[PDB]
Swiss-Prot record, chain A:
UniProt-recorded name of the protein: Alkanal monooxygenase beta chain
Complexes and interactors: Heterodimer of an alpha and a beta chain.
InterPro entries: Alkanal_monooxygenase (IPR033924), Bact_Lucif_Oxidored (IPR050766), Bacterial_luciferase_CS (IPR018235), Luciferase-like_dom (IPR011251), Luciferase-like_sf (IPR036661), Luciferase_bac/NFP (IPR002103)
Entry's family note: Belongs to the bacterial luciferase oxidoreductase family.
A Gene Ontology molecular function term of the record: alkanal monooxygenase (FMN-linked) activity
Reported function: Light-emitting reaction in luminous bacteria. The specific role of the beta subunit is unknown, but it is absolutely required for bioluminescence activity.
Any single biological process term in GO: bioluminescence
GO cellular component entries: cytosol
Catalytic activity: a long-chain fatty aldehyde + FMNH2 + O2 = a long-chain fatty acid + hnu + FMN + H2O + 2 H(+)
Alphabetical list of PROSITE patterns matching this protein: BACTERIAL_LUCIFERASE
Gene it is expressed from: luxB
EC number(s) stated in the UniProt entry for this protein: 1.14.14.3
Classification lineage: Bacteria, Pseudomonadati, Pseudomonadota, Gammaproteobacteria, Vibrionales
Keywords: Flavoprotein, FMN, Luminescence, Monooxygenase, Oxidoreductase, Photoprotein
Domain of life: Bacteria
Amino acid sequence: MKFGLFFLNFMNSKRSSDQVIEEMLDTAHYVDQLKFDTLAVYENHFSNNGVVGAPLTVAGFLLGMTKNAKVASLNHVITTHHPVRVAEEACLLDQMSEGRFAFGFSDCEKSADMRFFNRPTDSQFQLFSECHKIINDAFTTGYCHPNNDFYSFPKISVNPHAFTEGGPAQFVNATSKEVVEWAAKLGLPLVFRWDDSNAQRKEYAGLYHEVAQAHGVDVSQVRHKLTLLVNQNVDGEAARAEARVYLEEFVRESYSNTDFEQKMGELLSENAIGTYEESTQAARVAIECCGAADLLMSFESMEDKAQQRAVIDVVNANIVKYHS
Amino acid sequence: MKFGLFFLNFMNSKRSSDQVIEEMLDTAHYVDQLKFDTLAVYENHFSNNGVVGAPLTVAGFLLGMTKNAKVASLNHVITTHHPVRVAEEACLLDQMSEGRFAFGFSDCEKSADMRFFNRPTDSQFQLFSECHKIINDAFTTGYCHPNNDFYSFPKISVNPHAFTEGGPAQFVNATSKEVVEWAAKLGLPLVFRWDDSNAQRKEYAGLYHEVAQAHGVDVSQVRHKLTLLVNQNVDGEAARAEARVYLEEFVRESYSNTDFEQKMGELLSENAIGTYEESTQAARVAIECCGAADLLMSFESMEDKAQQRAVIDVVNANIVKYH
């Protein structure tokens, strides 16, 4: 397996956007040297729960400041951005970094964002697919020629052309069944979300697998990713309490209909939170029920830098290093 | 006077997109430990005359791989881009680099280019002024509230909030009198374009000065920039020749409705091309015409790497000694 790191960059009343970014940078540098495989960037708009609106811009600096690791967009929302712009941007990252960029994308998750980006809601999936078609066309051919109600424009050359044949590796955030089946037919690898339950995650995997074989897809060769929150404390009970506060607002905005306490409790126990073992096992379960080949972890919940790096070190030392 | 570099990143059948990106990268590094103050990036779409459509993404990488270096968008076309996105993107860079990014922006230099990204209009300059309005609001307040017609969205927050108080330094491309007047009115510094004639630049410079002062602006503190192409050769004729081939399709493209030979001949003579002497002379002249505070140069037209780097060498020593 491959083990990497993701940054959510959640902000708060005390913990500022300035701080988070800096922490992100310091950590990135810290693990540069280690056995971590990839550094993923979470996109979020208009809220405390993620201060990175432009994952691609962040990826440029991250790639710029590094030489080792791979950098990826975790959930680049294509559905609310112009596909041509995405292609160009992704292409530039691919070239500048000589193929170290990985393109993680997603459909629009919040209705607000969609409306906010003057995007037709009633046909979201169609638009998402269309946006995707434009991007992949660019990646794979160097050009685009849409002729539809979403886009209609004279054939164009999209510069720069991909450094990596076929464009930078792609992956789809598993946000829904529609998207999952879509990805299965295309045979693209997914990204199972740390915010979802194990059940959901598994159902999703059963879905993809079913669809994918149904499409002549060699599943054994598909490397799904999984994201999980990591927070290890000798006092397992404290680990939970710390992540709880870190996820308060997220749970209160993202998972509204769903009763709070139940979800919050589910997250604390399903994520790699608690003591070493507790932590370690949760991870094993998660992987197990979703079949992911690679893991990405977020250690951000650990407000203690000394404690956080410590955790990072054992994980690399006790886990990572072995898979190499 | 400050001296910086700019990248056009022009490709051709012979010189691929890959090639030119690499050279920029190398170049940026090579120049890092020098006296050059800034690294500027040119935006272009769907053509060989500029392979960088997102100078902001390039700015991130460039700043990421440098530490002392100043990086800027040369002519970011805001008109075609969501103003909100633009503000986040730029605030991110401001944060990440800790104040080392400069936001050089522009107004659509093409028409057809508009269609490929937004809803083209005629009241385009209005869209542009309103876009910049949104952008500067965040830059200065962290929030924006376009009550207007182009954009209407209630009070919203833009993260990250800026690293530099007031947002990153800004500068506008003098693409027309309309824009020049707007900038002046707002007290913004301009970027005089290497592709424009010395007379136009002087004009713009004069317009800016008059409008600005009448508006209570402190012109003394305005530091406009100027771009120029740089191609020095023992054989001044060989320098023009090389530059001519590099500028061929561009002249044909950006200046399709004017006499070719004349423009061409104008560019080759007013830019810092020729012999060292002709090059420097040409430079002084252009600087004196528009009165730029800082000079950004492009040395890309010199295909021979050793010759190019040498020119860069000569320039730097030259700044170290008198600047």
